[model samples]
Target: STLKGALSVKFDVKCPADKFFSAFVEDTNRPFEKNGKTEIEAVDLVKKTMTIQMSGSEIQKYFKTLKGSIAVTPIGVGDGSHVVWTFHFEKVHKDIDDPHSIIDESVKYFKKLDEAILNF
Candidate 1:
């Protein structure tokens, strides 16, 4: 409620922490293939979280800053992991819509990666 322009999503992937993180990290350009460059603005080893800050190019049309804060936590009693993606944005204006489509794309990509991991 405090942050109105923010969007957060989660995906449950069957892969373990190392394999999923490796799949996501090793193929960085999977999302930024056409848009602006991206950077690792912050990472938290303490919480097993990482944030990828989108670069200055396409997204600047709608945002001054955007970060995909990803956190991975293993299931309590299961073997798979749960991933949460929090899209935090510094909005350019109060009229712009939240980055729902962006999350959709991210979720879509995650599903693909999920399937890929299963197949592998």
Candidate 2:
């Protein structure tokens, strides 16, 4: 469909794949300050991937099938993981923004948590 779109991003995390993925969704290193409209709908511990659903007012108004995929892949040479995040969305109208701001904020938190573990 013309309104459908996707956004993916990645960063090198200096940590183990499974561990980082575990700590991420494990509620140890949290992502938000709890207005509590976000949820994790799908999780694959073996794959180190998860889909997070959102219901923020601006986002709910303009998009459908909207979810963020967060994943970690082991890198053979670096002893760390490739942290990836993506958003898949369908717009309710042609003019509505593509949720780039949310996507940007999504990636920012990932990076923050990336360093969050490393700092200790």
Candidate 3:
């Protein structure tokens, strides 16, 4: 079984507002994070956008720097917060065949992000 098509991931990430934002804004790995090199650029706290730039073998192929943003709102569940991450990426070089692959991967990624916030 081969894979094909685009992957769009949308889910509610549960964490404190700030910590959840930090994971996307800082902790996650970009294409350039490998080889012990890292760089970030043009962070605008007011607009909540940044031009992240990094140069490394792994990440340089996928993208350079793109528009990134984060928005968090309290969901009014005791102390929980609702986090939405919208990533607009160009279609990958090849599509995946498994219908569940995108959703499955999204679940894993979001779960990992949630765990990071929980432990933070």
Candidate 4:
């Protein structure tokens, strides 16, 4: 199965890029519930990007194979930034046959992360 999908969300936040990036990388599993497990695969501060591998009932049930990355870029000179999240995955289970549905659920996870950073 060569199933794969990607989604991006752009949001402006008052937090600085460095601070947002730090918080994002510092707590890899904070956004997820207690059951979910997230492992940081790589972090590139210079590039403002981080890659992670996540597994849980919510993720495993839909995406048998998944990998995701987040990129934070400074939007303006002031304390603001543009955050973009992307997910690349293969082999989604038949239960969630539609890729768009998978992407929709994935966005909710990303939003969880976004809320954490925005609140910080």
Largest TM-score belongs to which candidate?
Answer: 1
- Write one digit per residue (lDDT tens) for candidate 3, span 4-69: 233344456666555565566766455424553444545554434444434455533443322233
Ranking by TM-score: 1, 2, 4, 3
Q: Write the per-residue lDDT of candidate 2 for residues 75-119, one digit (tens) a residue.
A: 875578798888788778779887778777976776777677777
Candidate lDDT values, in order: 0.76, 0.76, 0.48, 0.70
Per residue, candidate 4 scores C-alpha lDDT tens digits across 52-115 of 8877787677777666788888877866877776666665654455446655665565556557
Off by over 4 Å in 4: 29-31, 94-120
lDDT of 4: 0.70
* TM-score of every model versus the real structure: 0.81, 0.78, 0.48, 0.73
Q: List the residue pairs that clash in candidate 1.
A: none
lDDT of 1: 0.76
User: CA lDDT of 34 in candidate 1?
Assistant: 65
Tens-digit per-residue lDDT, 1-116, candidate 1 = 32345688977877676667666765765557466677877766545678887855677888787888888877755477888887788777777788989899988888788789
